[PDB]
Subunit: 290 residues, 6 copies
């Protein structure tokens, strides 16, 4: 980097308005996609969480791991049942999901982050009853139907969670939690991140995705938008690809719940978190209420 020093200066100085806005605040980050599978992006993500924490910002990580679960099920020769396009989560599939999410995928992020200090701590809803789940149905070609032990976040121990954060820790959340009877369900990571963000009074929700941002008329490149209100985007929802739906519903639930902004950012960009939070050069889509 033979770039002149007087320009390295202005780039750092231009972070100041967002350092002020985020100082002392909770930022919830959904981590998934290629930012989770490529080692250079992986290590940049962990470094950015250490960054936030060494600015006195309070990052909270919620992670997915859909593909890793199905690979483990294939390795174990566990045959799936499928209603619509959904695998049914039997007690057996849940045990596998839990052990992959919490005992594999969560662990690598904890150790990556912890390469910068004693920051990361892995948690599920079962730990200290931090949050509960309610069983969810899906609608397949009409009819709402049961697909097993799959839920939404029900209640969140907001107080206990913020203590963890105020102590300097970076929670890395694996989305599993007990229902009211103690039966552990798997929760979609995108919706769980929205619920955590709302419960914790987060200042921002970040959703790492494998796309540049929200297109309204995909694939027209002219259709990429950089900011949008919830009213307009809720109207656009039925239009989007199957992959963008959960990310967009998360931002709707979050920002309607009072989180000031939710962002869909490009997880294939190194240090996308830094770019989105501390420069005005972000590719992402910012969702505000209206």
């Amino acid at each position: 980097e033979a770039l002149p020093t007087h320009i390295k200066a202005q780039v750092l100085a231009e972070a100041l308005p967002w350092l002020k806005q985020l100082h002392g605040k909770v930022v919830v980050v959904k981590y998934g996609g290629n930012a989770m599978t490529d080692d250079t992006l992986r290590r940049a993500f962990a470094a950015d969480m250490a960054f936030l924490r060494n600015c006195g910002i309070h990052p909270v990580v919620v992670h997915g791991g859909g593909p890793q679960i199905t690979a483990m099920l294939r390795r174990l020769g566990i045959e799936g049942d499928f209603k619509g396009g959904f695998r049914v989560t039997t007690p057996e599939v849940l045990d596998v999901a839990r052990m992959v999410l919490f005992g594999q995928v969560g662990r690598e992020l904890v150790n990556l982050i912890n390469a910068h200090g004693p920051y990361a701590v892995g948690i599920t809803g079962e730990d200290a009853q931090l949050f509960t789940a309610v069983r969810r149905s899906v609608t397949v070609d009409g009819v709402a139907t049961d697909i097993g032990l799959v839920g939404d976040v029900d209640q969140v121990n907001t107080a206990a969670m913020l203590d963890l954060v105020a102590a300097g820790r970076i929670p890395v959340v694996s989305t599993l939690a007990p229902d009211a009877d103690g039966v552990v369900h798997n929760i979609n990571a995108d919706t769980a991140a929205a619920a955590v963000a709302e419960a914790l009074g987060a200042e921002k929700l970040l959703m790492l995705t494998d796309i540049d941002g929200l297109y309204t008329r995909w694939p027209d490149r002219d259709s990429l938008v950089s900011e949008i209100d919830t009213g307009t985007l809720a109207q656009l929802l039925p239009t989007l690809e199957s992959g963008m739906v959960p990310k967009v519903e998360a931002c709707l639930r979050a920002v309607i719940g009072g989180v000031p902004s939710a962002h869909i950012i490009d997880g294939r960009v190194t240090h996308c978190v830094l770019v989105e939070l501390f420069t005005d050069a972000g590719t992402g889509t910012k969702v505000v209420r209206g």
Copy 2:
């Protein structure tokens, strides 16, 4: 229980001297064997940890899970290498060990305990860098030899651990931890419990075992002992069966490290923890220094 009320009274009153001795103290409990596999014993163990916690005693659980790892390795068709009688812990075997211990075995104890309240919290050494490991060799028919990513506890974040306890939580520890280079090792649960007990200034170390207690001349039933000093027991060590060695070495390292007493108790007895801690009717073997 049609037992006269005036005798239910004296049994409760006779717990008082041990309630006083244990109030506000750390008690580390190694959990394994049949107390971990049978549901009635399982649920009694979880209830006893909730008991300790609702007396203002500070229990810390360290758990094993040797047999569950090997079953999972067999299910995954992962072929083992064996030096002496020891499986070699490749990077692959560690990933499996970690995901079974932390994402399976630890989870069921957390949910069992948590049936009584928001007490249990699952942790490894990687979480908040709570403890580190140093790689260990074994000696096979002489020569010390490498069996992969297997270690002993190196350093323990004593302060951070006691904060967790003082907040009312029951840590459930899965024995994995990074070395000084961030490479995660698996640690024998018995030795890890001894190290945790010493680091935390525990008042007692409890070691749940599938035997009545320490026999000196097994199988003479006359040989069962109820208390012994470290000097005498260290001399007896080379005599014992292969299974009793790790449990006895744990008690030696703990009590020599200053834990006032380590106990080998019968994990096949329902509520053995309550029996050992709050009555004088215990079957176990108490180890003190001398």
Copy 3:
């Protein structure tokens, strides 16, 4: 006690639901009758208060001492005046009552409890203005009439009292307190216990009595009841013996004031507190609202 160990276990395990319910809670105990005069019961009562305290339960003791006052007055040759069946409390009788309750009866309980640790602390309403009294009249064969410096609890320094408890102390209260002009009155111990329980948000009020429990049609043994609501018991009040009235009015005032349950238990049973709180084998009468 050659009783099998596996039954000592279940008796201790069956205390757990009440340990959970009482952990961190205030329990007010009225102490009087034979539980106060017999040394074995005395020492069992003190041990049970140390028990509660070493479970992290917050016991508060309120004590009487009617017979001891009159013996001291006889020793001092102080002639009483009597309206109805009530001694008139002159300034002289109050001085004697105060010095017997606080400087004699309170002291022996403090030293008994303190045999188990630095727990007990003796207090009156005059200490730190912990509570005040309002002068009470009685009705004798009709007419309400003055019987001197005898009162009811007026206001309670709830905050200052809970600080004392949260510091690990067991207050032993002698029921004397100043009126609004600084004139110290003697308060009936049963009613004072009800008022303290309500003011402190106690979880239970215990009333030690020299009877098995509440009989509705004394002396029919078939008439003994184990639970009753305030509506039913208030209707029964005018029926009861002169001795049971103050104990029952205390439970009415307490449970109507929001204390979840008040209990009349048999003070002639060793460790009656333990029996009533930690087993379902109690002889007492539980009063709930309705």
Copy 4:
């Protein structure tokens, strides 16, 4: 008081150097003699303790009551045994001493002080094990001899005592305390005050006495001294009247123990505490080390 306002000003301004020296400090005051029996002096003493407390000074009161005990013993017709000039303290005499000191004499000071606010709190060594006693012998015409349950202060719960003070309370101490076996002894109030002052790191010990101050050659009025070192006064001790000995030994033990100054002041002067602490016009005798 038609005294010019500009002189009322200078009298208040001249208190400032002693307000600074005493701010935040413990001052132990032995209260006895006529300052305890005359109502105008009584009420002035209580007002001065409220004064100290409303300056953020930490007064601690230790009280005697020798004559009141013997009057109560005479009223109760309890015949004394006497070795030398000392009554023997039987178990019976102790019970009476305790109930008079703690339940009579201590109570009136608590209520007097408390006329100014919720300040005073009565305590003995038995309360929260605040201090213990060791049995003391006396020497009668030579031989050291037993005179029953009479002791010296042994150990003081310094930490627990300062918490009481830091919370804004004024402890009023009745000098009774258990020995190591739980047997309560009566302690001479003068020596107890010296021990409390030393244990608490008091800035001053005040000893209220029925004399102008220390005379060296009583009754020469020329012999009255205003300051003296411990070396000189220890040499003078064997010379003094029987009454002055305990007050002087208290000041020796205190100032040698590190209390910066002990004072013998005239308890027959209204507001003697204010005079001694906040003016240079005191009649008392100040004892410093040397």
Copy 5:
């Protein structure tokens, strides 16, 4: 001072009711006039602030310095513009006012007070944004007119100010503060003291003045009053000399804002603060609501 000791006592004892009333309370003191220019009065004022602080009272000093500013402007040869009888505060005059008030007049009081301890701390509204100003107009022979950078107190950081006080500091305030755009204005010290007193929930506002007290029909000496309600005094306002107006408007705004009493006291009396606060012999005028 050969004044009898028994009268020095009563003068100190008679301070007690006001020590109780003021213990732990904020007292705001406007300091100006001759109490600020004469060294003996200066040093008495500083000593009295140290007095309050060593009683656990919380004094807050607000100071003026009108004449010192104009002398400095004359020394600097800065020619004034005058509308009505008011100098126009140009940017230049403000710089001079700020540097005289904060860097000269405030400094001497800080060092005087600090001769008694580390108490005084100098502050303006610009420090930690402790308070802001809104630009004020005056009315000259009718028309409201601009006289430059002169304002009233707008908002006060009440919380941050009380932290400063609770830490044992004596704030010495120089009345300058930024408007909402960061432009620093000079504020009349009398009105600023009233605003600070109201914002901080002061118990008393003291206004040091170069007069005996409020006269209603000056110069009739019969017309001097010692207490008055706000309703009566507001009606009297239009009657008073030009000098008394700001002092009286301050007391009106303060006491109407809920400060229990504001006092106009004679700053030419040594230790006037002590006289006014701790005796009933004050010359001042007390203003209460009504």
Copy 6:
């Protein structure tokens, strides 16, 4: 700034190692020269202090103002006396120095910083006795000689200073302080910064200067050095220009006193603080011990 986003990212990511090193640490910054006179540099300096503070770093500003004092003295027509090349600091010159430093120069930095939040607070050694001074002599062509009220920092209230910082404030220090007799001296800002840094356990001392960095053989441009140990630089001292001496002696005293590094950086560079702290592209000279 049309600079590619992926490079704005790496510049921010490369700050992380210094964010970690400085998180929670004190950094003392000497502010003077052109960074204080040019508005763009001025505002960049204030922004960088707000930056540090919004990273949870603890900046402390010490400022000079030599030229502003002499301009004010000329405006006031105050004739100087000069020994060697030093103005004599009479009582009159000190009053002027204090009022310029604290009431002019300190104020503009406080308001600049405070444009970003309630951070800055102006202090001198007289405030809360934060630090004292000892009178210093200089040596003029040999003889050490008195030049009036000019001193070095003597003692620093380390505890009180760190409280101020831990509360989120940015102290802006004007270098004046009382000697042991309360006589306020002016202290050279460079040496004062070194003393403050050592007393506070600062992690870095920054010295803003009007040069690129330390030249060893000025004006050889080949002679500019980027790092140097104290042993080597102490040997070089007698070689340097008159202007560089105080900056270099400050770094010697600081780093020898245990501050890990002192830096001489170019105050004519915008955001030099950011450049020096968060990039490896700094022009400055770093001084470490050796």
